Each structure stands twice: as structure tokens, then as C-alpha cells.
Design a protein around this ligand. Structure first.
Ligand SMILES: C[C@@H](O)[C@@H](C(=O)O)[C@@H]1N=C(C(=O)O)[C@@H]([C@H]2CCCO2)S1
Ligand SMILES: C[C@@H](O)[C@@H](C(=O)O)[C@@H]1N=C(C(=O)O)[C@@H]([C@H]2CCCO2)S1
Ligand SMILES: C[C@@H](O)[C@@H](C(=O)O)[C@@H]1N=C(C(=O)O)[C@@H]([C@H]2CCCO2)S1
Ligand SMILES: C[C@@H](O)[C@@H](C(=O)O)[C@@H]1N=C(C(=O)O)[C@@H]([C@H]2CCCO2)S1
Ligand SMILES: [Zn+2]
Ligand SMILES: [Zn+2]
Ligand SMILES: [Zn+2]
Ligand SMILES: [Zn+2]
Ligand SMILES: [Zn+2]
Ligand SMILES: [Zn+2]
Ligand SMILES: [Zn+2]
Ligand SMILES: [Zn+2]
Ligand SMILES: [Zn+2]
Ligand SMILES: [Zn+2]
Ligand SMILES: [Zn+2]
Ligand SMILES: [Zn+2]
Lengths: 266, 266, 266, 266
């Protein structure tokens, strides 16, 4: 009669998988992912930090761009994550096997990462990736220092329970630049109200809008660059149109309020 | 010359290790731990639930009291935890090996449980126990239903990041009894202010006082019975002097404020 | 230019995904998987045992067939595995979430299961599935007893390092039937000689042929029924043509020797 | 009446905890543990390797001796283990937190390490330590190369299921020196015959005697130096009396045969 369906691969728009050469953000910060997925390399005298890696199949491209930047596999010391979904943490397990890198994440992100994104609160097992273990668990507001660059965690639960913004200060033209890598504030296909797997979802999102609003934020970057109005293919104008953290938070709250209203009506 | 010190066992007052027979709290809820450590057995038509197990060496005593209550190892379905320290989650790994029980806990409690309490934010490796894995991760406000009894999680971070109050409604003399098993609100030897491993410690405690204040709470129990003024050795008057959740929260906040002041002066 | 390739789903022949009603093997043993993937239900007075579950998408079908057999989710006590690949252990994580079942496996199978089949010695990350934790680690020759039925583990490393045969005695027409569930002895696309990830691969396979040869084996079953010449769609003649364990081992060794010769020439 | 007993710390002879300065074994290999517990530092141009760390409380001493040798925490790349008991793998978790080091171990050692030595086949929970995760799983005969030094794993199951000998070639006075770090072959208090948790214990020990016999072995070292007749306190004559691998294997088999006979009589 009728067999069970085949497994369906997690497929994405081609631009999410389009390799790009390293794009400099500030003196020591580079976008090294693809056109439409962020993966940030921060280079220090004492080794390199990677914030996100994009999709699972991006590992070799990431290592190629690191090499181009002067970063060997031994030189990658630390991987940080916005959140532990397949399109942002996808290649973490493989990067750990192929480099010196250790992962630091909050408890929520660590337990989702360790199950490869399976049993997702909203997606079930539809969007899985190779599991990885965290080496260090961070608390809200905790700092991690690499080669003199200080990264601060700001929890902003919602898109996932463990969603995190990471902030650090780089330089450019001799001046300090406070970079805010703010996580996703979307809720794609989520049941927002009365969700038994996430009862306080709405409150957490609202607190997260306020957290993002208030971040130290000369420059905002986001895991999907379009959410902060970056265009990584636009070269010297890639960041010209970028949103402030205040504007990003406001746009995400407006969208969220619309989704709530549509869910009540739907 | 001078060898490194021997490992120091986690030792406790004798009353914490003094076995007691099952003490009935309500129609289906029993204290089955020791005189000075709580371990709550909730019996349903559909299997039994255990909330905490006390110290690591209490596993066999717990199983003996379960048998006395009509609960075989196969009948224990679920273990819930106040928090994942050695004096409350100690025997969880062994109970999982010896019974049908699965563990449900929040992400913070799950990652501390999986490392056997090692790398504690405050105690280091001084207070470890056999590690165990959680089978289900719960979110704040999530419910779990066993044999018709509904348990609700209320996160109350502070004593540990994953500290949780568990609430359920039992009966007694035909009437409903709203039981609140509220976690510890102590901070024994903790650095409260400017703690790099827990930057928002003070805020979390203050929110946790408010959470405990507001719990549905005809009857309060606590992992250390003395914190809620229970005397498990007093038989028919064991619970007579018990605090309300409001009074427990207020006393813990008063103590916490004193500790803050002493830390500033110390 | 050219994006990175999309992720490729693990796809299989339709017959591997074709549901079938429970097929009785002996008094208490049933095939409950699909036409071309084995999943064995063994029913005891003291709960049920499942040996393999097939592909990840088979979980609900398995639970439907268990219900048909009188086995509720609470009644499933134990999951055993031939080996921890996606086409045999696929639905284990979900079954653990949805039933009372605990997993017993050897250390090799446990560490592959816990990484969802990623970083496979031969397949890399091409064939992954939701990760699951083992509850009990078994040693070679160890027995596990459920409701009076005694299961014995026989390690037969090769297809995976943790490949295992499981044996037990059922009954049929008042007589004992020694059932041998022997794991795969294939090496699909494997580098056999000088493999840096499995240096003693050839020796392990040869020992495994001898192990399978000698199993207590009135009736042989295999994870892919065609390997033991079962036809689960043939009803009352499904097992008529089944191989002996001796014949299965001999055929697998003949095939393996051919593959070795072809690899030397290739 | 009578409380349950206090937890009993894992205590050891003082000499096992007596710090010593680094003792050179060959051009790039040093003993850096205590008088009576081995911890081997192998220094390469490309970072350092540690084989065992001794007891849990030795972490800081190990890092002090590494510093004395020119090895900063960032420089420690790899930790290898003889076996995952508290007196040899004790400080691994803490070393991972405090250094760049990643752990490579076989599956058996990895699952015992991840449970901090709890649920030991012979010791139960009497001898536990902080749990740690392996970063790489090795197979029998697999090699790992650091800064040009090639380490080969030789499984020698018995003392634990995951017991391993590690071999590598160093130099001394311009000549190659084949170093064999052979694991323990003792069975302290073990039930050898008919052990339900280790049915093939005797066969594994006998195969392990043969494995040790045949190792490439200009110089033998062992986790307890006295087992190979090393005296780390004897300075320039520390290794003068050391056994060959053949003699070590023979002495261990003689002892094992005596223990078998005594167990039959006991
Ligand atoms: C698995 C899903 O989380 C992802 C997907 O659809 O593939 C995207 N992630 C997003 C994020 O915000 O991380 C949402 C955004 C990206 C552009 C459209 O909405 S949708
Ligand atoms: C490891 C420590 O957390 C425990 C200990 O000292 O053994 C106690 N736990 C307490 C709790 O509140 O859980 C504190 C209370 C109990 C009575 C004195 O303060 S102290
Ligand atoms: C991921 C692979 O392991 C599986 C696959 O190709 O999908 C099959 N498993 C087999 C086994 O023996 O488990 C091999 C057999 C089945 C029929 C052809 O060879 S191939
Ligand atoms: C937990 C136990 O494994 C250890 C102990 O007793 O503390 C020792 N380990 C040994 C080994 O061989 O690793 C045995 C040896 C050392 C000297 C006496 O027998 S005894
Ligand atoms: Zn610079
Ligand atoms: Zn996402
Ligand atoms: Zn996304
Ligand atoms: Zn009742
Ligand atoms: Zn505590
Ligand atoms: Zn306590
Ligand atoms: Zn029958
Ligand atoms: Zn397979
Ligand atoms: Zn297969
Ligand atoms: Zn040299
Ligand atoms: Zn040992
Ligand atoms: Zn030892």
C-alpha cells in the first residue's frame, strides 16, 4: 500500500549556503560564513574565537576562511553560540573534532546542542544536526576573556530557551566599537500562547526585547544578517544600512505582536 | 615532606542520616526519607513519584520504605528534584538503575546532575555524588501528570541555578490540599555580590522569594524540613508548626539581607 | 557562483518503510517493524522487550503494533539493539520519551547511540538520527532477565564496533525454541584493510563469523530479514526459507572474502 | 537508634599523594605526578601530551610541574589514560577546565570516565571522581600523532574493560627508545570466576597478559610505578630495576593464577 515517508532533509535558501570570502567588521572581527548566515571570527594574540558556524555543511568552508585569516586549527580556542539550531550551530561537532576549539554555552543551549537539536520545543525532530558537548557552562552576565577581548553573555530566551546575545569591544580607526551579536527574535511557526512545552514563552520574549533594546551596541550583527539589515554581499557597504539594537528590538516586537493577534484569530 | 591532603568525604549531621518509617502527609503523599532530609513519595493508581532522595547512601532505605508502602521498583515511574546537590539528589543514579524511574528536571538541574554535582558554582568539587542523566527537560510552569496527579514546576533560581518548587493537589478528609515542595533559599558560604560565576545571583534570589511567596500553598514542605519548621520525628504533630510559604519566603529574605550586610562588612 | 550542497536525507528502499501487522515468530516473540526491517517485540508477564526499532520515522507504527499486541507505552520495559545505525536504532530516542523503556547496550553501541550515529567510522555524518542515552551498559556474555525470559549478549564487532547478537529461548507447540537475533555482517562501502579508524577490522569480522557460527540457534533472525532469508510478507511461510546461523556466517564470510579481494584489486 | 553510615572518602597511602619534581624518562618524556602515582608529560614542538593524572587532588601540582617544564595551560593538547579509575584519571575533568587539553579514550574508558567511576563493575560507587567527557574515541591499534610523536593504543582489558597500553618512541643519547606505558594487570578484590557483570573476565586477562608480553618495549612504565619496579624517589637510579614487559606480564599472570586458586578455595 503506502510506505511511511522518507526522511526529509533540512533544506534552506541557496544564499544561506553561498560561500563568501572573509568580510572585515572591525580590527579583529570578521564575517567568515556565507552570504546569508553569520559566522564571526574574532582574532586575538592568544587565539581565535568563533561565534556560530551556520549550517552543518559549512565546516570546511569555515576552516578555509580561518586559514585565509592566519588561523590554523590549533589556533581556534573557543566557540560561542547565539542558539543551538541546525542553521547556526550545525558544524560545531565537526569543528571540535578538527580544531582545538572548546564550546562555552548556557545550560539550555548545552542540552539542546548535546541532543543535536532533536526534541525541539517547536520543530520536534525535523531540524537535527550532529550533537556536541559544551566544555564550559556560562551564566547570565558571565564574561569570558580571550587574548584580552572580553565577551559578555546576555540571555535573551525566546527563539530558543537558551538564546544568547554576545557583546564585546573591538576597535576601528583607533576608536572602540561596541559590537552586539544579538540572537534571533523570530518565532517561526511557533505556538505562542498556552504552549505546554514553553508556558512562559510570551513573557520571555517580552523581556528579551527589553534586553536587546539596552545592549551596548555601536554595531549590531545577527545570525541571519537580514534581520539586522546587513548585506554581506555588498562589500564596503555591507553594514551601511544596519539597524540599531533599539530598532531591531522594536521591529521584532511589532512582528511578534502581529503574530500573537493572528494566532488568536487563527 | 608533606603529601597532598586526602580526599574529604561529604559528612553531615547524624539526624540527616537517621532512617524513619513512612510519615503520611496527605492521602497519597508520604515522607520516606530520614529524620532531617525530605524524600516525598506520591502514590497514584498509575505508579509512584519520588521528589528528592536525600543523600547517596539513602537508596536502599528509600526502596525499603517504598516496599512498605506497596511500591515495587517497577512501580516507581518518575523522580523529580528540588535541586541537584548531593544531600537531595544523592541516590538518583542508583535509584534509576534499580527501578523503572525516569528523571524530569530543568536544564540547569540536568547539567549539574549529569556532572554529579562537580564544578559547583560555590562548592567546587567538594560535594560530589554519582552522576545521572535526565530523561525529560522541563520548562518553567510546565506540568507533568502521573496517575491523575498534576505536578507543576516553578523555577526559583538561587541556591542553585536550577532550584525548583514543585506543587500538586492531594486530598485529606475528602478535601483538597495544595502541597508546595519549595526548594532551599539558603546561600551557605556563598559569595553573593559580584560573583563571576553567578553575576545575577542577588536578583534571582529576590525573584525567588517572590515566587515562593505566591505559590499555591495549603501545606509547605522543604528539602531540609527544619527550614519550613517541620519535625518529622514528632509523629502526629510533625507538621503542626509548619510555616506558610509567605513566612518561609520572608524568613529567607531576612536572612539573605543579613548575609548581604555581613558580606559587605567582611 | 555555486552554493554548498543541501543536506541529503538518509533515504531507503520503500519496502524498508512499508508497515506490516505483527507477525508471530514464537509464543511470545513478534516481528512488529516493516516488511524489510526487523523490530522484535518479546512479551512477558512482567513487561515487554523491544529488539531494534528500524528507521527514525517508525516510532508511531511500532507503538501502534505494540497496542495491537496488548502492550501499552507503560508496559515497554527494555530496548535492546543489534547495532546503533539509523536504520535499526532510528526511533530509540522517541520511544524512550513516549514509553517506560530503558536502553541496555554495550559501551561501543552506547557511545554511537549518544552521538546519534554521527562521526561514524565509515559513513561520517551521512547517516544520523536523534541521539539517545543508554541506561545500562552490558558486557560480553552478560544476561538480562525480563519476566522470566533470559537475554544473552554475544559481541560480534565488525559492521559496527558495538554489533551484538541477542539470544533467548521462547516456546512453540510446547517446545523450546532457541532464537538468535544475529547482527549484520555486511561491510557496505567500508575500507577493510589498513583502515586508520578501525585497524583490527578484519580480525574482528573473522572472530564475529565464528561467534555467529556457534550461537544457540533453532531460529535465526537478522536486522535486515533478507540477510537470513526471511520474507516477512509471506505470512505463514515467512520463516520457511530462513538460514541457519552456520549458513548465515558462511555466506557472510564468503562475501567478505570477495570484498577483500576486490579491494586489493581496486 | 543507628544512622546510616557517613560517606567514606577514597583514601590512599601517603606516598601516592607525595609531590615530586619532574623526573626525566627520555628526551621528551617526564614523570610529573607523585612518588607512587605515574603521570607522564610528553613534550613536542606542537604541544604537550599527558598520560594519566593520578588522584583528583593532583591537578594543581600537575600544572605546577608542567609550568616548570615550559608547558602553559594552553600548551597541553591531549590527555590519554591507562584506565578510568579515581587514582589515575582523578583530575581529568579539572585539567580540561583549566587547560586546552582534549581527552582521547576507548569507548569503555569513555563511558566509565563520563560517570566519574560510579557503578564500577567491582567497586560500585566506593571510588568515584569528577566526571569528564572524551573528545575522541579510539579503536584498538589506532594511532594519534602530536608534534611528530606517534602514540599507539593497545587494548588490554581486565583491570577495567577499557584498560589500555600506550606506546611511543622517544630518544635518548641520540638513540630511539620505545616506551611502553602498560596499564594495571591487578584484580584487587575482584570476583574473577562467574562474575555476572564481567562474564569473560578471565579470558580478557589472559589475552591482556599476551598483549603486554609482545609490546614494543625498551622501557616499561606503569600507573603504579611499583608494579614495574620503578622507584621515582631514587633519582638517577629510578628506572634501573625496572621490569621488562615480558617480566611484568609473567609476574601478573602468576599473581592472577594464585588469586584464581585462592578464590576457588575461598
Ligand atoms: C529552523 C528555523 O529557525 C530557520 C529555517 O526556517 O530554516 C530560520 N531561522 C530563523 C531565525 O530567526 O533564526 C527564522 C528567520 C530567518 C529568516 C526567516 O525567519 S526561520
Ligand atoms: C551542601 C550544603 O548545601 C548542605 C550542607 O551544608 O551539607 C546544606 N544544604 C542546605 C540547604 O538549604 O539545602 C543548607 C541549609 C541546611 C541547614 C543549614 O543550611 S547547608
Ligand atoms: C547505512 C547502511 O548500513 C544501510 C543502508 O545502505 O541504508 C544498510 N545496512 C546494512 C546492514 O547489513 O545493516 C547493509 C545491507 C542491507 C542490505 C544491503 O546491505 S546496507
Ligand atoms: C581502586 C584500586 O584499583 C586502587 C586502590 O586500592 O586504591 C589500586 N589500584 C591498583 C592498580 O593496579 O591500579 C591496585 C594495585 C596498586 C597497588 C596494590 O594493587 S589497588
Ligand atoms: Zn588590531
Ligand atoms: Zn533558530
Ligand atoms: Zn535561524
Ligand atoms: Zn486516596
Ligand atoms: Zn543544596
Ligand atoms: Zn541541602
Ligand atoms: Zn506463552
Ligand atoms: Zn548498520
Ligand atoms: Zn542496516
Ligand atoms: Zn629532543
Ligand atoms: Zn584501577
Ligand atoms: Zn590503581
Amino acid at each position: 500500500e503506502v510506505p511511511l515517508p522518507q526522511l526529509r532533509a533540512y533544506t534552506v535558501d541557496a544564499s544561506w549556503l553561498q560561500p563568501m570570502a572573509p568580510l572585515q567588521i572591525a580590527d579583529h572581527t570578521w564575517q567568515i560564513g556565507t552570504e546569508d548566515l553569520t559566522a564571526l571570527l574574532v582574532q586575538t594574540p592568544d587565539g581565535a574565537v568563533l561565534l556560530d558556524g551556520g549550517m552543518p555543511q559549512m565546516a570546511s568552508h569555515l576552516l578555509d576562511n580561518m586559514k585565509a585569516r592566519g588561523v590554523t586549527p590549533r589556533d581556534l580556542r573557543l566557540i560561542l553560540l547565539s542558539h543551538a539550531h541546525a542553521d547556526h550551530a550545525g558544524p560545531v561537532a565537526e569543528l571540535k573534532r578538527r580544531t582545538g576549539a572548546k564550546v562555552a554555552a548556557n545550560a539550555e543551549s548545552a542540552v539542546l546542542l548535546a541532543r543535536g537539536g532533536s526534541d525541539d520545543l517547536h520543530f520536534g525532530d525535523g531540524i537535527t544536526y550532529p550533537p556536541a558537548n559544551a566544555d564550559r557552562i556560562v551564566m547570565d552576565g558571565e564574561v569570558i576573556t580571550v587574548g584580552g577581548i572580553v565577551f559578555t553573555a546576555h540571555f535573551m530566551a525566546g527563539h530558543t530557551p537558551g538564546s544568547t546575545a554576545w557583546t564585546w569591544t573591538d576597535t576601528r580607526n583607533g576608536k572602540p566599537v561596541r559590537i552586539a551579536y544579538a540572537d534571533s527574535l523570530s518565532a517561526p511557526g511557533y505556538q505562542l500562547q498556552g504552549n505546554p512545552r514553553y508556558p512562559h514563552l510570551i513573557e520571555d520574549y517580552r523581556r528579551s526585547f527589553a534586553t536587546v533594546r539596552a545592549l551596548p551596541c555601536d554595531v549590531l550583527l545577527t545570525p541571519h544578517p537580514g534581520a539586522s539589515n546587513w548585506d554581506y554581499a555588498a562589500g564596503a557597504r555591507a553594514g551601511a544600512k544596519a539597524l540599531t539594537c533599539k530598532a531591531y528590538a522594536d521591529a521584532a516586537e511589532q512582528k511578534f505582536d502581529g503574530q500573537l493577534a493572528k494566532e488568536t484569530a487563527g
